Structure 1
Amino acid sequence: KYIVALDQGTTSSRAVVMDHDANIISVSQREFEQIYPKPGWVEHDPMEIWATQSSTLVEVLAKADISSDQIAAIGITNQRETTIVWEKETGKPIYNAIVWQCRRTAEICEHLKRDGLEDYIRSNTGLVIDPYFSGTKVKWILDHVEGSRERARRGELLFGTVDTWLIWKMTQGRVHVTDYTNASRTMLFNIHTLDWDDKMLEVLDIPREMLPEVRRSSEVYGQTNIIPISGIAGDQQAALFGQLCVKEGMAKNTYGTGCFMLMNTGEKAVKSENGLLTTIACGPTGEVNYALEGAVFMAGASIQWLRDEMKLINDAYDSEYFATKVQNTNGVYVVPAFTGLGAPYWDPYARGAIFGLTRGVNANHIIRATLESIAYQTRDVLEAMQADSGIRLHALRVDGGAVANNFLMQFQSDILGTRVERPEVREVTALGAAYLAGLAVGFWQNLDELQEKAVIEREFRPGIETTERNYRYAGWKKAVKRAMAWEEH
């Protein structure tokens, strides 16, 4: 018997299958197109996530040889903030999905800031005025369609995040729900009252009619035909969960398309004074917990950039090798604000920049610097978490696709002067959802049943280069400050 998890990420759509003993049985991944219609805009095609996600399922089940008969449940994880609008009759989008990365609604945020909502929005959403979240994306959509709002008050139009979206497409239009994690991300939901914010909804001209049903991250939402879908959670939270985040002061760092660092604050909503978000996570039964999040838009994606647009590498994996043919970046720094700067910076105007170039700098210098931005960004966040939380991490737990890079991991350790523990199974985001789902179905009963699959494959400890860490970081800082505010308005 088994649970099946669905992780639908920025980059790709996956499908993992574990057993009762929570063992990864088979996986299916399928990449998909990123669309950049312009400048710092990002977009995905709803039908393609859909298509991509579906297909992945099948092929996993088929792969392993299993049927509708042996699968206890369906756990669902997904990319956050990314907004979708869609005609209810049809099951057709009215626009392409707008990505968390996408910077279009920057002006709108400027109004909000102009108006005075910062204080409000922070306080109730835990969020920060930025095009990063859902709110402004929706408005922009209804604002960039003739028959929009109106069609939507009459409710022919549904809003939703990749979880809501993926769900509805499987509950064949039946079920229109989001979880608690997902909703927080929106800028429209209130984290204390645990429901849609009346003010936001107004201020942004959104129609309660389009908002789905907000529910627990472990609950049977419904049943689908490959059976019941019982878990839901934003990818970052699912990973915090599969890491066994779960208890106060517990923290992880995920290295994927972006970097998201989260720390459980249990039942206290801590107010960040250092550029972090206050958001929702799960407690050991999948219940509402609060947390501190530091989001960094570009991490692994820089590598994909080298690999796909610059064409400096064939595989991302090749980056360790080239990076280490070098010893130093020769002075070069890479600020990867390709889609603005996230925490703790939040400057949607910043754009990517390379620096400190001279004639002897070559491709390896460049690749490796790229890799380094990853550590540096992490470090910027970490410091913030420490300040906000008063706690000093002694080790950093990590997961994500990039964590297979020993160079980066080690570099990460030196740069922070902290140990780095690299978990045995990297596919933790999935794991998270599975539990949430299995738990909810009596598949597991207890989280404790699992304080065992979480083996530590490796510890990285600070080398002697760690002494140099503050000089290097200062570079970084200098650099960053100069990519800042590139774009205008």
Structure 2
Amino acid sequence: KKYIVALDQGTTSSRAVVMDHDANIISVSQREFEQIYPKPGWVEHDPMEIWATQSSTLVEVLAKADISSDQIAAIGITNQRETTIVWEKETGKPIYNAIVWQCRRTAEICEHLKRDGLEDYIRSNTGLVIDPYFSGTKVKWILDHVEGSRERARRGELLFGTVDTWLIWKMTQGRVHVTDYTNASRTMLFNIHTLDWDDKMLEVLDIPREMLPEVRRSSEVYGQTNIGGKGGTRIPISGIAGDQQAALFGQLCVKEGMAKNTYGTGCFMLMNTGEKAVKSENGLLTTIACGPTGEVNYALEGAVFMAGASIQWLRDEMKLINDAYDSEYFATKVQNTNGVYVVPAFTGLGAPYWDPYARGAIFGLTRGVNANHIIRATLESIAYQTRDVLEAMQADSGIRLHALRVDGGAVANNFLMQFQSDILGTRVERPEVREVTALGAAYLAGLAVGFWQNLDELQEKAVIEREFRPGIETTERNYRYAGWKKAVKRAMAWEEH
């Protein structure tokens, strides 16, 4: 039993990683799944596709590396954080598509909450802001949408779950229905204090206690999978965290004050707040993180819905680039957006604007503006956003980040990185590997099964490939922000209710 295996269920792709005692990545496997947009502002996913893509990779990784089930010390699970799922207990057949995190359909409802005045309750018990972002709404919506539901849900013939959940469920064959705290913290049906399903909540959204799973800790054994190979040979499942949290962990930010920014589908900057929860005064999120070994901790989170995803759209949608010619490629061909600004409200906004009507937009178009400027402009949106939240965190946190700890594909983008640094007017530290996410789950489940005893051992696995120090001055720096901001406003409240 020499390997930990991590299931990394992205927003965009299912991943699988093999890592050794040395916490090395032995092998990886990636499967993309369809981004479903039933309609503008909507985003779905096929549970099956998820499942399928994730199971398959899981196999592939082993496959490829001659590794046999029986060397799999255990399995860690990390996932895309809010997308909701509902399916028939008996069958396990979804009553409906996955309603992913970015999907803005709830919105309305959110207004009702708004209107009924739970701002506070919610915020004060969930740490959450009112948004279409979170599971609660989703669930409901489903229920509502799908006829018999509630009633059947009442007889819990119907089940609820986030991705970690669903996965597991499937890996165990119904055997186990569970989530972990990190995940649970985002449903907006779960008290992050009490640490239980929030009655009032369920009450409100009117969700059967019956469909929710057992919340558990991020590292622990929740069960096991049979994936053939040697007969009656099973694999323990013992790690579970929100991709975002999974990262902070892999990042070894197990101590309050430690923060990171993940450059993925969205930007996700989290700060450990130790064992203490932190109210956000700057429309930030307050949630559940991992203790130095997956215990309960807290964090401050800055959620930016549109980040690599951005990049991905210039590619697959705008078709303005390829896997051949990088965003960086071009971006660097010009020396500026030419005044251009991109506002990736592709999904509405969020931290800290938390608009759900704000929509994607370009500004400051000139006769001579080209792709490149566009490209770049895009690329910069990221840094921008980041800044926002960043700044915000300080506020809330009360801590100046002196350098930035980053992770996620995007971070490979030297340009971006630089800019980020400039723009921040802060060094930015780019590590050896961006899999921190997977690491985390690795770590986690690994820990949970002794594979490792503690982050200690691997305090030194962490390598700073590069650091970027600002090269722009306040003035300037403070200037561009200006437009960015200018722009930003222009995008909001776009969509019609």
For residues 78-119 of structure 1, what are the alpha-carbon distances to aligned partners after superposition, in whole Å with 9 as ceiling and x for unaligned?
Answer: 001100000011111100000100000111000001111111
How far 1:464 moved relative to its partner? 4.3
Show CA shifts across 1:122-169 (max 9, x none).
000000110000000000000011110001111110000000000000
What is the distance in 2 between the residues matched to 1:38 and 1:425?
Answer: 36
- Secondary structure of the residue that 1:280 maps to in structure 2? strand
Aligned to 1:429: 437
Question: 1:4: Cα distance to partner?
Answer: 0.3
SS at match of 2:5: strand
**Structure 1 residue 314: Cα displacement:** 1.2
* SS of residue paired to 1:189: coil
- CA distance in 1 between counterparts of 2:475 and 2:251 reads 30
Mapped contact 1:43–1:99 kept (Cα < 8 A): yes
Post-superposition shift, 1:69?
1.6
Secondary structure at the aligned position of 1:464 is classed as coil
Task: Quote the Cα distance in structure 2 between the aligned partners of 1:197 and 1:279.
Answer: 15
Q: Distance in 1 between matches of 2:322 and 2:404?
A: 30
Do 1:41 and 1:102's aligned partners in 2 also have CA atoms closer than 8 Å? yes
Residue pair 1:307, 1:316 contacting (<8 A) in 2 also: no
Q: Distance in 2 between matches of 1:243 and 1:328?
A: 32
SS at the partner of 2:77? strand
2:63 alignment counterpart: 62
**Partner Cα separation in structure 1 for residue 480 and residue 96 of structure 2:** 44
- The alpha-carbon deviation at position 316 of structure 1 amounts to 8.1
CA distance in 2, matches of 1:473, 1:316: 31
Q: 1:278 to 1:464 in 2, by over 3 A?
A: closer
Q: Partner of 2:161: helix, strand, or coil?
A: strand
Q: Quote how far apart the aligned CAs of 1:418 are.
A: 0.4
Counterpart CA distance in 2 for 1:430 and 1:111 is: 37
After superposition, the C-alpha distances for 1:267-298 in whole angstroms (9 at most, x for unaligned) are 11010000100000001121000110000000
Q: Distance in 1 between matches of 2:26 and 2:475?
A: 43
Distance 1:315 1:429, change over 3 A: same
Q: Note the C-alpha offset of 1:424.
A: 0.2
Q: In the alignment, is the contact (CA less than 8 A) between 1:142 and 1:148 conserved in 2?
A: yes
Residue 414 of structure 1 corresponds to which residue in structure 2?
A: 422
- Secondary structure of the residue aligned to 1:233 is strand
TM-superposition CA deviations, 1:439-464 (whole Å, max 9, x none): 11010112101111101111111124
Could you tell me how far apart the structure 1 residues matched to 2:99 and 2:483 are? 34
1:364-420 CA distance string (max 9 Å, x none): 010000000000000000000000011101001000011110000000000001000
Task: Tell whether the 8 Å contact from 1:304 to 1:316 is kept in structure 2 after alignment.
Answer: no
Report the 3-state secondary structure (helix = DSSP H, G, I; strand = E; otherwise coil) of the residue aligned with 1:195.
coil
Q: Which moved more, 1:177-186 or 1:464-473?
A: 464-473
Question: Over aligned residue pairs, what C-alpha RMSD do you find?
Answer: 0.9
Alpha-carbon shift at residue 176 of structure 1 (Å): 0.2
Aligned residue for 2:96, secondary structure, equals coil
The 1:367/1:396 distance shift into structure 2, 3 A limit, reads same
Aligned-partner Cα distance in 1 for 2:481–2:339: 12
- Provide, for residues 14-53 of structure 1, a one-character-per-residue CA deviation record: whole Å limited to 9, x for no partner: 0010000000100001111011111201000101000000
The offset of 1:315, in angstroms, is 2.3
Find the residue that maps to 2:70 and give its secondary structure: coil
How far does residue 431 in structure 1 lie from its aligned partner after superposition? Answer: 0.3
Q: Percent identity?
A: 100
Aligned residue number for residue 159 of structure 2: 158
Matches of 2:455 and 2:306 in 1, distance apart?
32
User: 2-side partners of 1:103 and 1:455: how far apart?
Assistant: 38
1:370 partner SS: helix
Assess if the C-alpha contact under 8 Å between 1:317 and 1:405 holds in 2: no
Tell me, which stretches of 5 or more residues in structure 2 are unaligned?
228-234
Moved over 3 A (4+): 464-467
Structure 1 residue 466: deviation in Å?
6.2
Per the TM alignment, residue 251 of structure 1 is displaced from its structure 2 partner at its CA by 0.5
CA-to-aligned-CA distance 1:306-331 (integer Å, 9 cap, x gap):
00011111128610010000011111
Is the 8 Å Cα contact of residues 106 and 137 (structure 2) preserved in structure 1? yes
Partner secondary structure for residue 277 of structure 2: coil
Checking the alignment, whether the CA contact within 8 Å between 1:164 and 1:176 is kept in structure 2 is: yes
String of CA shifts for 1:44-78, please: whole Å, max 9, x gaps: 01010000001001110011111112110000000
Query: Counterpart of 2:202?
Result: 201
Q: What's the secondary structure of 2:31's corresponding residue?
A: strand
Residue pair 2:218, 2:241 contacting (<8 A) in 1 also: yes
Secondary structure of the residue that 2:385 maps to in structure 1?
A: helix
The residue aligned with 2:312 is 304
Q: Distance in 2 between matches of 1:40 and 1:350?
A: 10
Q: Which residue of 2 aligns with 1:190?
A: 191
The 8 Å contact of residues 425 and 472 in structure 2, kept in 1 or not, is answered as: no
How far apart, CA to CA, are the structure 2 residues paired with 1:456 and 1:483?
A: 37
Tell me if 1:280 matches 2:281: no
| Contact 1:127/1:187 (8 A) holds in 2 | yes
CA distance in 2, matches of 1:316, 1:338: 25
Q: Does 1:478 align with 2:486?
A: yes
Deviation at 1:428, TM superposition (A): 0.8
Cα deviation, 1:337-380, whole Å, max 9, x if unaligned, reads 01100100000010011000010000101000000000000000
- Cα gap change, 1:148 to 1:70, in 2 (>3 Å): same
- Rate the CA distance shift 1:317–1:429 in 2: closer, same or farther, 3 A: farther
Contact kept in structure 1, 2:423 and 2:472, CA below 8 Å: no
DSSP 3-state at the match of 1:16: strand
Counterpart Cα distance in 1 of 2:451 and 2:421: 37
Per the TM alignment, residue 467 of structure 1 is displaced from its structure 2 partner at its CA by: 5.2
CA contact (8 A) 1:84 1:98 kept: yes
Q: Residue 40 of structure 1 contacts residue 338 of structure 1 at CA under 8 Å; is this kept in 2?
A: yes
Instruction: Provide closer, same or farther for how the CA distance between residues 464 and 354 of structure 1 changes in structure 2, counting only shifts above 3 A.
Output: closer
Partner SS state of residue 473, structure 2: helix
CA distance in 2, matches of 1:39, 1:364: 26
- TM-score normalized by structure 1? 0.99
Q: Distance in 2 between matches of 1:487 and 1:135?
A: 22
3-state secondary structure, aligned to 1:397:
strand
C-alpha deviation, 1:465, in angstroms: 5.8
Local SS of the residue matching 1:468: helix
TM-score (norm 2): 0.97
SS of the counterpart of 1:15?
A: strand
Q: Quick check: 456-465 or 57-66, which moved more?
A: 456-465
* Structure 2 residue 266 is matched with structure 1 residue 258: yes
Shift of 1:220: 0.3
CA distance, structure 2, for counterparts of residue 123 and residue 64 of structure 1: 48
